[PDB]
Amino acid sequence: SDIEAYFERIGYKNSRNKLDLETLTDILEHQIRAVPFENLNMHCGQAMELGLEAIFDHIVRRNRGGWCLQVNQLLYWALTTIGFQTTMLGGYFYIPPVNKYSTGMVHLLLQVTIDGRNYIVDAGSGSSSQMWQPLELISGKDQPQVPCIFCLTEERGIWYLDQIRREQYITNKEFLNSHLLPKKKHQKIYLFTLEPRTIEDFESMNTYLQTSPTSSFITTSFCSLQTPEGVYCLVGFILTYRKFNYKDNTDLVEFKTLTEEEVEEVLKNIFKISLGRNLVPKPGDGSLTI
Numbered sequence: 001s002d003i004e005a006y007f008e009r010i011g012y013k014n015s016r017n018k019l020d021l022e023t024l025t026d027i028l029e030h031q032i033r034a035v036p037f038e039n040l041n042m043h044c045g046q047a048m049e050l051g052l053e054a055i056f057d058h059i060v061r062r063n064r065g066g067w068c069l070q071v072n073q074l075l076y077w078a079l080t081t082i083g084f085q086t087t088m089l090g091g092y093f094y095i096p097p098v099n100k101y102s103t104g105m106v107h108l109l110l111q112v113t114i115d116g117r118n119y120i121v122d123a124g125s126g127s128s129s130q131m132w133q134p135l136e137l138i139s140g141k142d143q144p145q146v147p148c149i150f151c152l153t154e155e156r157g158i159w160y161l162d163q164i165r166r167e168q169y170i171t172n173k174e175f176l177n178s179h180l181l182p183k184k185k186h187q188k189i190y191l192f193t194l195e196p197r198t199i200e201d202f203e204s205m206n207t208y209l210q211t212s213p214t215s216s217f218i219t220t221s222f223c224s225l226q227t228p229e230g231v232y233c234l235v236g237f238i239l240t241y242r243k244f245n246y247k248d249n250t251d252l253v254e255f256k257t258l259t260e261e262e263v264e265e266v267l268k269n270i271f272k273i274s275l276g277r278n279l280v281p282k283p284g285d286g287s288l289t290i
């Protein structure tokens with residue numbers, strides 16, 4: 001069955017029968033530790049399809065990852081299939097280079113409801129903005145996790161996801177001021193509303209993110225993967241590993257510039273990604289941070 005194939009791909013053993021927060025959390029953790037956030041198809045002449053069947057084949061059968069519109073849509077399907085009350089929601093991503101949120105609803109995230117209680121579930125935020133556990137929809141409540149403290153705030157009927165990050169210790173002197181590093185401790189991630197969506201509500205933005213000259217995905221090859229202690233992120237030729245809370249409430253960040261030849265090996269061994277066509281990695285302009 002497709003659902004067993006999905007659980008195998010994320011390494012999850014669905015042995016407990018229960019549709020509770022522990023189960024939801026375990027599945028989220030498993031997915032973000034197995035299925036990379038990635039846009040590499042856009043850099044090897046291949047499709048960024050929005051169809052669930054195409055996404056399932058790519059992620060589950062070919063052991064690839066994707067961006068929010070894919071990985072959260074797959075998670076939507078899995079959670080729905082096993083019986084969680086799940087809704088797709090649309091968000092607007094914060095754009096640090098211009099200190100504004102996106103005009104377009106470029107982000108897909110989920111809400112899961114368990115006996116009336118609401119949780120925001122997003123397996124596709126990218127790099128060190130990624131939640132490890134679901135966030136309860138409670139405005140103003142601190143939600144500390146290993147990555148950072150997450151904050152959901154409501155203003156004027158709009159919901160805002162922010163994080164408070166630790167100080168960063170950079171082990172490579174050459175990258176102390178990399179444009180890959182988030183600058184502020186207090187970072188806006190995205191905003192959203194509780195209006196239920198269908199995947200067709202993202203069809204126009206799926207195209208936009210592949211074609212608009214404003215899209216950072218066109219000019220940046222990006223992949224990230226969570227681990228139980230940190231985050232791997234490859235942006236063009238620059239491989240980074242972040243260990244959360246290394247010491248003294250500080251994160252540790254390693255950087256290495258890869259050769260073209262080393263990219264393929266790193267993709268295989270770190271991200272479990274094998275590409276069927278030639279990749280053209282692209283560094284970006286600091287729009288997509290680790």
Ligand SMILES: CC(C)(COP(=O)(O)OP(=O)(O)OC[C@H]1O[C@@H](n2cnc3c(N)ncnc32)[C@H](O)[C@@H]1OP(=O)(O)O)[C@@H](O)C(=O)NCCC(=O)NCCS
Pocket residue numbers: 067068069093095097098101102103104106107124125126209212214215216217287288
């Ligand atoms: C979201 C994104 C496509 C921009 O969205 P958009 O709907 O085009 O944004 P806007 O229309 O609000 O653009 C605002 C302005 O800032 C500019 N701008 C957008 N991104 C910029 C960037 N990264 N650097 C500098 N300027 C930028 C645009 O040129 C635009 O200029 P204009 O006002 O003269 O038209 C782009 O910022 C992006 O690719 N973001 C990544 C989102 C992400 O990380 N998602 C992860 C989950 S999939």
